[PDB]
């Protein structure tokens, strides 16, 4: 029957029942190795069951976020109600702080996102496309600051807690690294930042989904500011030649780890000893990692085989190992009271105004650099105002535009690092 | 080859030069994150350079095991000479001992090996393995007492100080419990015995590595001795029963990792709280690890695609993350200082004769009772003599036979228990 064959995390139900029996035995006997092996052993189980619950829910998965949101909410509730025995809490805090698997995860995501972009695409996008990204950022920022002064929210709170998390790669890479940068630079608690940022992020994702169809209808009505699914205007772009990838052995995927930690190591060395403050402002090593990986991509040292190698490794981390990270984030980062306080009418209108600002900034930039504004708006702001990779396909499926998926990937992935750099700057500057 | 087209660990010289520059900056500026992400960088860089060096040194490539042995010796020398900064030692220790990445490695290898075998060949394989290890212990003891008579060391001193710690499990279980048993029985000083026992143990671990490489060469020259791969004579392998496996995506690899971690967790819970010691014999959890995974394979719970995914994960660990593990083992689980302070002609000769007697005994037992000599000497003759799970990984890696990690762990842990029993007998019987 369905009860024997239903899959949890790619496992048949009886096998997952065996795994859950193992977890319950560990909880009952209070025997658990507080290291990587035990931490993974419990976090995979919890993440698997609750991410399957979150994914197979009608309205939750499509809109709120699905498996990551449900997983970390449930883990936070488990901590709040004191369900975890102290040893599981120690194991999770060990495999996220003392082992610092979190930094490895974020480094892998950053390098896999940035290094995977085609070198020719990156160099071409640095000409005129990235300016549209940054002008979308600044337009969203000014609209958000205006609506914040309308509601009396201070300038700094609007700039750090609303505009940056919205313009991110989501909770994966763009709401967790932002929280880490906030804790390192400013110094206050990171639980507050992440908890109040994830709500705004999801609300902005909903509004991006809606504004996708709104912009589609607008483009249908009026044509001079509309295109038929082509980003660039009056440009043939006749032939682009892309290097073929021979094959992806396990060796190149391992090379993905080497470049992931090596770039992280160099960024840490730079930001802790070489250039602690480029101006009067300190730069967190995540921004330096973004810059270093972008420079390495531009230099072309990595063969096209290695580029796809790191992308393959990032896909493993971002799709299979994400649930473990989300359990860890629910334990170590979330504060449910802050999340409940975050969902309010003021925040759900601030997020919509911010996304509108992103749309207008992106459109005006795209027109200034020769793009059709209606696709420029979607690709530069709406793809940016999402949960990273998860939201790009959803937004571009809300519209009838799939030919822009490459630019959507460029936006989400690489703007996820641009915003990291900008956010380090802003955290230093405002405070 | 060409100075720019050559490949180090899959990376070209310019890219690897960038990585090496990162390592040198981290060393000289004394900036290093003491965690997984900052620890792996060191381990990949050093392992890559010395594995490439080790694979190309003329006499070293085949006769003394090549790349992993080179990496091990170089890492041990580096920590001995003080080249590693304190932070580098702390990071590598945090990766290996704190986070138990070694335990994760061994668990994944065990899961990959056991879950990828025909269910009906399991018990038939194991039933003859125990007599092999037991009479290998017998042969090692025979040669030990012979060489002790040659050097005039009394047979009781030989058995209490050399033959038992060598054939024991290792430092964690096999040299500490031996110290406890010795202090309980004879009432003499404990830490005095432990200090020399660990030194002799490390000496024989080194000789086990060298002899493993030599036996691999012998198996290459004489085909009939070594049945490459499976140790069983494979006269019953003519059936070669197999079932079709569909295409396995990333998810099956993660399912394999989940199974590895949760089976380790179940084994830990069992061996700690449920059945701590059958009879008077203490049982390491890695013994239950093998039993748990074997039962899971016989239970038929896991679909063939899951087994293939676990095999692929085992291949990724065993062929890519191996050199990292060798750097870690060299740094953490081998102190060249004590072996230098306890080196002498007598110790070296006794350890060599003990190890070669163990090899001869295991080969006799294997060939007498349906096992290929070499594959029944690398396991159960050498994997008994070496130092714990690290010893098994080292020895098997020098033989390029990681298919037998399950047999190696069975040998190491069960032989540790049997040797503990033999000690509890012989300490009283001689004294």
């Amino acid at each position, epitope marked *: 029957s369905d009860l024997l064959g239903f899959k949890i995390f790619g496992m048949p139900l009886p096998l997952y029942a065996f795994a859950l029996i193992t977890l319950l035995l560990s909880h009952f006997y209070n025997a658990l190795p*507080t*290291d990587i092996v035990g931490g993974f052993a419990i976090m995979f189980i919890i993440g698997a069951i609750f991410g399957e619950i979150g994914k197979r829910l009608p309205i939750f998965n499509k809109y709120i976020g699905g498996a990551p949101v449900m997983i970390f909410l449930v883990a936070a509730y488990f901590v709040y109600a004191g369900i975890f025995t102290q*040893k599981e809490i120690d194991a999770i805090s060990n495999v996220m*702080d003392k082992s610092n698997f979190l930094n490895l995860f974020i480094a892998v995501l950053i390098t896999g996102a940035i290094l995977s972009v085609n070198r020719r695409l990156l160099l071409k996008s640095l000409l005129g496309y990235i300016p549209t990204i940054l002008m979308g950022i600044v337009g969203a920022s000014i609209f958000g600051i205006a609506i914040g002064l309308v509601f009396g929210i201070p300038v700094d709170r609007i700039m750090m807690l609303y505009v940056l998390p919205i313009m991110g790669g989501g909770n994966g890479a763009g709401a967790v690294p932002l929280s880490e940068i906030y804790h390192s630079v400013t110094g206050r608690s990171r639980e507050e930042y992440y908890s109040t940022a994830i709500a705004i992020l999801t609300i902005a994702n909903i509004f991006a989904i809606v504004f996708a169809a709104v912009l589609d209808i607008i483009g249908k009505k009026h044509t001079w500011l509309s295109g038929e699914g082509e980003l660039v205007r009056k440009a043939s772009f006749k032939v682009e030649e892309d290097e073929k990838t021979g094959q992806i052995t396990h060796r190149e995927t391992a090379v993905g780890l080497v470049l992931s930690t090596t770039c992280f190591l160099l960024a840490y060395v730079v930001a802790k000893k070489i250039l602690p403050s480029i101006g009067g402002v300190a730069i967190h090593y995540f921004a330096w990692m973004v810059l270093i990986v972008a420079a390495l991509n531009a230099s072309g040292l990595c063969s096209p085989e290695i580029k796809a190698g790191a992308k393959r490794l990032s896909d493993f981390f971002s799709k299979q190992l994400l649930w473990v990270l989300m359990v860890g984030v629910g*334990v170590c980062y979330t504060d449910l009271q802050e999340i409940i306080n975050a969902i309010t009418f003021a925040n759900v209108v601030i997020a919509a105004i911010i996304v509108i600002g992103a749309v207008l900034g992106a459109a005006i930039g795209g027109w200034l650099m020769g793009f059709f504004p209606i696709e420029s708006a979607i690709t530069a702001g709406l793809c940016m105002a999402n949960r990273g990779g998860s939201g790009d396909l959803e937004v571009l499926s809300a519209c009838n535009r799939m030919n822009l998926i490459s630019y959507a990937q460029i936006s989400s992935r690489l703007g996820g690092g641009i915003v990291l750099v900008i956010a380090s700057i802003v955290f230093g500057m405002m405070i | 080859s060409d100075l720019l087209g050559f490949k180090i660990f899959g990376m070209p010289l310019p890219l690897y030069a960038f990585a090496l520059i990162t390592l040198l900056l981290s060393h000289f500026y004394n900036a290093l994150p003491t965690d997984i992400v900052g620890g792996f960088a060191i381990m990949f860089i050093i392992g890559a350079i010395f594995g490439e060096i080790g694979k190309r040194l003329p006499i070293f490539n085949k006769y003394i095991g090549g790349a992993p042995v080179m990496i091990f010796l170089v890492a041990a020398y580096f920590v001995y000479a003080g080249i590693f900064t*304190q932070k580098e030692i702390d990071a590598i220790s945090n990766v290996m*001992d704190k986070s138990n990445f070694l335990n994760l490695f061994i668990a994944v290898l065990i899961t990959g090996a056991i879950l990828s075998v025909n269910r009906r060949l399991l018990l038939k394989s194991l039933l003859g393995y125990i007599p092999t290890i037991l009479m290998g212990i017998v042969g090692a003891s025979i040669f030990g007492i012979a060489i002790g008579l040659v050097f005039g060391i009394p047979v009781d001193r030989i058995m209490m100080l050399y033959v038992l710690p060598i054939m024991g499990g290792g430092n964690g279980a096999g040299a500490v419990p031996l110290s406890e048993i010795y202090h309980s029985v004879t009432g003499r000083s404990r830490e005095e015995y*432990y200090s020399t026992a660990i030194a002799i143990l490390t000496i024989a671990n080194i000789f086990a590595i060298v002899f493993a490489a030599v036996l691999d060469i012998i198996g290459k020259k004489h085909t009939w001795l070594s049945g490459e791969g499976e140790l069983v004579r494979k006269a019953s392998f003519k059936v070669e029963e197999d079932e079709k496996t569909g295409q396995i995506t990333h998810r099956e690899t993660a399912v394999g990792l989940v199974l590895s971690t949760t089976c380790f967790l179940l084994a830990y819970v069992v061996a700690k709280k449920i059945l701590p010691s059958i009879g008077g014999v203490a049982i390491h959890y890695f013994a239950w690890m093998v039993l748990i995974v074997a039962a899971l394979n016989a239970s038929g719970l896991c679909s063939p695609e899951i087994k293939a995914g676990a095999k692929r994960l085992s291949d990724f660990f065993s062929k890519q993350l191996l050199w990292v593990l060798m750097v870690g083992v060299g740094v953490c689980y081998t102190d060249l200082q004590e072996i230098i302070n306890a080196i002498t002609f007598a110790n070296v000769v006794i350890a060599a004769i003990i190890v070669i007697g163990a090899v001869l005994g295991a080969a006799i037992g294997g060939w007498l009772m349906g096992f290929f000599p070499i594959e029944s000497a690398i396991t159960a003759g050498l994997c008994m003599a070496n130092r714990g799970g690290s010893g098994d990984l080292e020895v098997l890696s020098a033989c390029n036979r990681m298919n037998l990690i399950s047999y190696a762990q069975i040998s190491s842990r069960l032989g540790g228990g049997i040797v503990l029993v033999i000690a509890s007998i012989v300490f009283g019987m001689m004294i």
Partner: antibody, heavy 119, light 109 residues
Framework: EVQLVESGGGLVQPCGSLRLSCAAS????????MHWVRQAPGKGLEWVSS????????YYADSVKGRFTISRDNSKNTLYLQMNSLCAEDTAVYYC????????????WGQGTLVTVSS | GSDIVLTQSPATLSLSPGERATLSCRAS???????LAWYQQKPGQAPRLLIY???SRATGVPARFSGSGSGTDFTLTISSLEPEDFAVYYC?????????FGQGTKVEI
């Protein structure tokens, strides 16, 4: 990673009451089992009490059972030890230390306050 | 209460800068899972963790500190003393729900 006791202390008459605090900062105070460890002058360390996160399990040394009371307030990142019926023997420096379990026994030690109880 | 009672044998040590220390600690009964820790305490200072498990070293400790032993007997041996290593050392067990420290061994010049 920095913990400061900086509460109570000073002179208290015997059979009196006293309350201590520890404003932990720089690490997740919640999720960490916290302990109180005291050291009478010129003597060795001695455990006093322990508490899980969320106050789930409170245990006390047999010496101070029933007279002391440990409580934590996670939202303020503060650990309270409530002392009742002090006597001459309960004079010491009162460290609060974080018990990280298998990975570090008492990894973070506060700067203990000195409580002198005497006539 | 049947609390584990830890007794460090050498009540004091008087050693020159360069040589071994070989401290000791003996338990009342078996310390399960080798849950034992060694703390260094400078005078007028909070203690400092050295050997958090029975054998594993803490983060900042040098390589010379190294514990060993299991069951009811434990040692902490300093390979070569240093002028800043002269302090008092406490043996701490935490296997049960009644962590018990040790009396204290002083290493002096």
């Amino acid at each position: 990673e920095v913990q400061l006791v900086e509460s109570g202390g000073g002179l208290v008459q015997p059979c009196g009451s006293l309350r201590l605090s520890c404003a932990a900062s720089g690490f997740t105070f919640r999720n960490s089992a916290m302990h109180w460890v005291r050291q009478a002058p010129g003597k060795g360390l001695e455990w006093v009490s322990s508490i899980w996160y969320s106050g789930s399990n409170t245990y006390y040394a047999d010496s101070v059972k029933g007279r002391f009371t440990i409580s934590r307030d996670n939202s303020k990142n503060t650990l309270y030890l409530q002392m009742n019926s002090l006597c001459a023997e309960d004079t010491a420096v009162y460290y609060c230390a974080r018990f990280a379990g298998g990975w570090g026994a008492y990894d973070v030690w506060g700067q203990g306050t000195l409580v002198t109880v005497s006539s | 209460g049947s609390d584990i009672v830890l007794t460090q044998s050498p009540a004091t040590l008087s050693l020159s800068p360069g040589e071994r220390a070989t401290l000791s600690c003996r338990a009342s009964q078996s310390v399960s899972s080798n849950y034992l820790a060694w703390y260094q305490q400078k005078p007028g200072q909070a203690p400092r963790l050295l050997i958090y498990d029975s054998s594993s070293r803490a983060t900042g400790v040098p390589a010379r500190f190294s514990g060993s032993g299991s069951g009811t007997d434990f040692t902490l041996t300093i390979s070569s003393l240093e002028p800043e290593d002269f302090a008092v050392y406490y043996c701490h067990q935490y296997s049960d729900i009644s962590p018990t420290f040790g009396q204290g061994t002083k290493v002096e010049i």
